[PDB]
């Protein structure tokens, strides 16, 4: 007769009614991804339309339930997650124009066009092309030309579209009784209604800034080392005091620096730890890889795979008989069935991607003991970090030689360890300042701190001051440079990767100290430790029922987001970088634009 | 999806041991009387399984 009983009844009814629809939609999506035909796409579209109609219908009845007369935290969180208006508090024409702009931007970004001059052909799509030209090439002219073309052709063309998109998003955020769109995106890490464990929505910016202030020395040393190693490759192209150019970062946008491992390798005569050729010499396939991954997961304390996991997963590419996407995805159906869609090869990266997907499935099975409104990770970075930590811990030579991949008589030299640490640095920390700068730019352009003009000017001044990247060609106030990414042109956040990076080292240090292991962290294997596995299993069962601060305190023992584990992990590499940068210049300076 | 098996979900009181109920009256969670039709707090008692 009270509000609590009616709220619980409505929540139970919604959870019982939406599970079947979600399972049908997931099955349709699986049938579409595993079989590209004219009927699967129609079935998936119909399922998506039905799900959208159901979600829109089950929102007005949930909004009627008040939130200020609730004593249960779980019911309040479920109602807050269900009463999300989103794109509903707006006008018809405004929402239609916003959807049209989103769709046309997505199509323009997905299609793409090269259209090289003085050539009536060779105007390719996002298929193989400028990617490998900007990744594994050493020519300055073609790289500069590609970096200019990709930013001038898919750039200023979407400037008014992006302006209207930002304006409409700010209007939607302000019309929902909330602050600007930046605050709406930051509200994902908001914790209210809990005494002691409350986390302010604005404290996230201060925490990120405090972590970046301590990351700054390591990133500066890494940038100095990269510049010193690059000056020997491009004579009279990079100054030891200036900043590195944009098109010489091994990436179209300079996000990942994985392609610089072949040019910045200190010991080029020492082989890596690639055990790909060791598996092809004997009977090994995707089934054996998944069996070894399950054996590694059960050695910590995680349960085994489900019965439907081994009879429904398509771990082998069927070939030309049918079209199927080979993108590694973790399917969470919600009815006890869990399967992974991946064309697992006998390579090395797939060996860790399989463990990543298995950790995702483990987290799914862990939080599957909650209602539908809570069957998800704590934040948008924990679900990926749970698999990322396992993929990082499974790539150790000790685990490979214990399974039977690496030879037991293989010596553990320090050159290979330094090379592995440098590769991990280039693949992890190389995107942290870029992500931070992009997120700060999005926050300042959504809040209102940046006027309508002077967007690219402030973008480049931040990329020169905060980041160590400089543009090779000057761009006026008409080009649209930041809109060249996928997350910006499709309304996707970027702080999730930064949170995952700041949480993975903490989780690794916690799971290593829980097993009573001595020595450095880069060689600490999470195996044969039941206490750490039990702690991780108890922590993953929280999900969205409890705040992420309580989960971090239960898995680590901290109430904030710290970066000290990252420093403790990179200290063996930080000391080596300090010793190598003794006869060089540390840091970078501004006012060195190659104009 | 097999929608042939159903189950009773909403009730106003606990059942006695070895008791079987046949009436399928709509449940009422609020003070508003349910006039035989669904509404804000008027839900169907029987729910199907998947």
Query: What DSSP string describes A58-102?
Result: TTHHHHTS-STT---HHHHHHHHHHS--SSSSS-HHHHHHHHHHH
Taking an 8 Å cut-off on Cβ atoms, the answer to whether B30 and A16 are in contact is no
Please tell me the distance from the alpha carbon of residue A233 to that of residue A242, in angstroms, as a whole number.
16
Angstrom distance (rounded) from CA A551 to CA A234: 48
Question: Is there a contact between A6 and B50 if contact means CB atoms under 8 Å apart?
Answer: no
- Technique that determined the structure: cryo-EM
Q: Does the beta-carbon distance from A6 to B10 stay under 8 Å?
A: no
Q: Give the residue numbers of A annotated as catalytic, written as ranges.
A: 357, 487
Give me the resolution in angstroms, 1 decimal.
3.0
Cα distance between the two ends of chain B: 6
Considering CB atoms only, which of A1, A16, A61 is closest to B47?
Answer: A16
The strand pairing partners of A331, in sequence order, are A339
Residues of B in contact with A19 (CB under 8 A): 50
Q: What is the C-alpha separation between A353 and A385, in angstroms, rounded?
A: 12
Quickly tell me which residue has 């029922």 as its tokens.
A545
User: Quick check: B41 and A17 in contact, CB under 8 A?
Assistant: no
Compute CA distances A551 → A195, A236, A391, whole Å. 15, 52, 21
CB contact under 8 A, A19 and B9: no
Q: How many CA atoms lie within 13 A of A220 on its CB side?
A: 17
Cβ separation B1–A20 shorter than 8 A:
yes
**Among residues A368, A367, A288, A305, which one has the least CA distance to residue A339?**
A305
Candidates B10, B27, B29: best to mutate against A (most CBs of A within 10 A) is B29
DSSP B1: -
Phi first, then psi: give them for residue B6, nearest 5 degrees: -120, 175
* Nearest chain B alpha carbon to A9: B29
The annotation places the binding site of A for substrate at 255, 327-328, 497
Query: What CA–CA distance (Å, rounded) separates A243 from A249?
Result: 12
Q: How far apart are CA A420 and CA A422, in angstroms?
A: 5
Taking the C-alpha atoms of residue A131 and residue A137, their distance in angstroms, rounded to an integer, is 10
For residues A236 and A215, what is the distance between their CA atoms, to the nearest angstrom?
Answer: 30
* Residues sharing a CB contact under 8 Å with residue A225, sequence separation 6 or more, in sequence order: A264, A577, A580, A581
Interface of B with A in 8-47 (CB under 8 A): 9-10, 27, 29-31, 40-41, 43, 47
Q: How far is A10 from chain B (nearest CA, A)?
A: 8
How far is A260 from A538, CA to CA, in rounded Å? 40
What is the Cα–Cα distance from A236 to B5, expressed in whole angstroms? 77
The answer to whether A76 and A193 are in contact (CB under 8 A) is yes
Q: Which two tokens stand for residue A297?
A: 């997961």
What residues contact residue A315 under an 8 Å CB cut-off, 6+ apart? A286, A287, A290, A340, A342, A343, A344
The alpha carbon of residue B30 is apart from the nearest alpha carbon of chain A, in Å, by 5
Residue among A175, A150, A324 at smallest CA distance from A247: A150
Give the helix/strand (H/E) hosting A430: none
Contact A154, A112 (CB under 8 A): yes
The dihedral sign for the CA sequence A556, A559, A564, A569:
positive
What tokens were used for A551? 């989960």
In angstroms, the separation between the Cα of residue B16 and the nearest Cα of chain A is 22
């Amino acid at each position: 007769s009270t509000i609590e009983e009616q709220a619980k009844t409505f929540l139970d009814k919604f959870n019982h009614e939406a599970e079947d629809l979600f399972y049908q939609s997931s099955l349709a999506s699986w049938n579409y991804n595993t079989n590209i035909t004219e009927e699967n796409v129609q079935n998936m579209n119909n399922a998506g339309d039905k799900w959208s109609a159901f979600l829109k219908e089950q929102s007005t009845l949930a909004q009627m339930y008040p939130l200020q007369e609730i004593q249960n935290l779980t019911v309040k969180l479920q109602l807050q997650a269900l009463q999300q208006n989103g794109s509903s508090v707006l006008s018809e024409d405004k929402s239609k124009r916003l959807n049209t702009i989103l769709n046309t931007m997505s199509t323009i970004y997905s299609t793409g066009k090269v259209c090289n001059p003085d050539n009536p052909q060779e105007c390719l799509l996002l298929e193989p092309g400028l990617n490998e030209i900007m990744a594994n090439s050493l020519d300055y002219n073609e790289r500069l030309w590609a970096w200019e073309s990709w930013r001038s052709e898919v750039g200023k063309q979407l400037r008014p579209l992006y302006e209207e998109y930002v304006v409409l998003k700010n209007e939607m955020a302000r019309a929902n009784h909330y602050e600007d769109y930046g605050d709406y995106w930051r509200g994902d890490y908001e914790v209210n209604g809990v005494d002691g464990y409350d986390y302010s929505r604005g404290q996230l910016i201060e925490d990120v800034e405090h972590t970046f202030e301590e990351i700054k020395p390591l990133y500066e040393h890494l940038h100095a080392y990269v510049r010193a190693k690059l000056m020997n490759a491009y004579p009279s192209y990079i100054s030891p005091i200036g900043c590195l150019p944009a098109h010489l970062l091994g990436d179209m946008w300079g996000r990942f620096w994985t392609n610089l491992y072949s040019l910045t390798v200190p010991f080029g005569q020492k082989p890596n730890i690639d055990v790909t050729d060791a598996m092809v010499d004997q009977a090994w396939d995707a089934q054996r890889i998944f069996k070894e991954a399950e054996k590694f997961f059960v050695s910590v304390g995680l349960p085994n795979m489900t019965q439907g996991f081994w009879e429904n997963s398509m771990l082998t590419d069927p070939g030309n008989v049918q079209k199927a996407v080979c993108h590694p995805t973790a399917w969470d159906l919600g009815k006890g069935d869990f399967r992974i869609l991946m064309c697992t090869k006998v390579t090395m990266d797939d060996f860790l991607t399989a463990h990543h997907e298995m950790g995702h499935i483990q987290y799914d099975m862990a939080y599957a003991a909650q209602p539908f409104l809570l069957r998800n990770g704590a934040n948008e970075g924990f679900h990926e970090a749970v698999g990322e930590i396992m993929s990082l811990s499974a790539a150790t030579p000790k685990h490979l030689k214990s399974i039977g991949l690496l030879s037991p008589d293989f010596q553990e030299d320090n050159e290979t360890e330094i090379n592995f640490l440098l590769k991990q640095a280039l693949t992890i920390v190389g995107t942290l300042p870029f992500t931070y700068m992009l997120e700060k730019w999005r926050w300042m352009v959504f809040k209102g701190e940046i006027p309508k003009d002077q967007w690219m000017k402030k973008w480049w001044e931040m990329k020169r001051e905060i980041v160590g990247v400089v543009e090779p060609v000057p761009h006026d106030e008409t080009y649209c440079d930041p809109a060249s990414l996928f997350h910006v042109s499709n309304d996707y956040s970027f702080i999730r990767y930064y949170t995952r990076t700041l949480y993975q080292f903490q989780f690794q240090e916690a799971l290593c100290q829980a097993a009573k292991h001595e020595g450095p962290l880069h060689k600490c294997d999470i195996s044969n430790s039941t206490e750490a596995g039990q702690k991780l299993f108890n922590m993953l069962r929280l999900g969205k029922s409890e705040p992420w601060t309580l989960a971090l305190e239960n898995v680590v023992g901290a109430k904030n987001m710290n970066v000290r584990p990252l420093l403790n992990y990179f200290e063996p590499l930080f000391t080596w970088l300090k010793d190598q940068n003794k006869n060089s210049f540390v840091g970078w300076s501004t006012d060195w634009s190659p104009y | 999806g097999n929608y042939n098996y159903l189950y009773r979900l909403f009730r106003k009181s606990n059942l006695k041991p070895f008791e079987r109920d046949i009436s399928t009256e709509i449940y009422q969670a609020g003070s508003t009387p349910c006039n035989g039709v669904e509404g804000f707090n008027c839900y169907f008692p029987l729910q199907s399984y998947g």
